[PDB]
Symmetry: C4
Subunit: 93 residues, 4 copies
């Protein structure tokens, strides 16, 4: 509950940072930058977007190292502390 709340907030802030950075330095629209930030930190990494500037590459290196742990923490607690009880609730006779 409180754990999930913190991780949601932390995830939102990280994604806001990426949205601002990539829309500014890499010139992406502020939906494409959000989309790209999510595709990056979840490691899906389609490559339809990727940094073309050296500033962007360096930021992306740091963004990945800092952001992956947080994003996957959130995914983990979202699945465990929100999705897992909910699926069980849909089971009990």
């Amino acid at each position: 509950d409180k754990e999930f709340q913190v991780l949601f907030v932390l995830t939102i802030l990280t994604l806001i940072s990426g949205t601002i950075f990539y829309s500014t330095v890499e010139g992406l629209r502020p939906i494409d930058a959000l989309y790209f930030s999510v595709v990056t930190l979840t490691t899906v990494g389609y490559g339809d977007f990727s940094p073309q500037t050296d500033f962007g590459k360096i930021f992306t290196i740091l963004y990945i190292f800092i952001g992956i742990g947080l994003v996957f923490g959130f995914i983990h607690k979202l699945a465990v502390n929100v999705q897992l009880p909910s699926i069980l609730s849909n089971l009990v006779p």
Copy 2:
């Protein structure tokens, strides 16, 4: 057993949702949409397919966050509660 059964079903439903969504909104064939849904949620993310519409990008953000935990749960219990005993069975003298 019962755990694996639930996770298979949950995984199938998630993949059906993606198949329907991406075939409709992104115009993919209903084998390409399934393939793309799997490549996305397993985070392989080749990028031979990716959403081109804003609707598709927004759905993909949510689809990844909701679906990755479930898909990797299934992969985990498939490997542990199905593959792991099977490999041991092929070992015992």
Copy 3:
């Protein structure tokens, strides 16, 4: 030791299967098919190669679900039961 040995063998067989499949059905050279099989099951997924046939897409769906757990098992025990002691050995005064 015995654990790592089994996982290496299991990983090799999975990669041989992919090498054979993608060189045959997708027409890749039998170094490109191995390379592509590894890039797939480790989820790096560059997309410089990807299946173009429906046979290839369907196999890839199944290959990912079956193979990821095994490959990451091996990576995990390679890091823990081989790399982790080795790094400690290079430490003790």
Copy 4:
């Protein structure tokens, strides 16, 4: 502390190796090679860069298997032994 210190050093050395290898054999600039090494070992795998030579493909296979465990170890202990207390410190009334 000491754990994180070792993993940072180990991660740096692995990334230096990739930077040297891909700048030499694949002809990348020594910022693009670092960027590509990071995108590879974190499994983001955009594919804006990828090995074009057989030497590069073979090295990449081995680099991924050896490097992923270490890089994700570092990410894990960076998130747990550095980020996790820091976020808690910003919480206590």
